[PDB]
């Protein structure tokens, strides 16, 4: 669990998720 790992978890949460296209 580092700073780089955090960027990932957060990368797949916000700044997206509109018409279901983040998975």
Question: What is the rounded CA–CA span in Å between residue 13 and residue 8?
Answer: 9
Q: Residue 12: CB partners within 8 Å, gap ≥ 6?
A: 22, 23
Q: Mark 9-22 as b/e (b = at least 16 C-beta within 10 Å).
A: eeeeeeeeeeeeee
Question: What is the rounded CA–CA span in Å between residue 21 and residue 16?
Answer: 8
C-alpha neighbours within 13 Å on the C-beta side of residue 19: 0
């Amino acid at each position: 669990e580092t700073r780089e790992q955090r960027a990932i978890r957060l990368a797949r949460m916000s700044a997206y998720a509109a018409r279901r296209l983040a998975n």
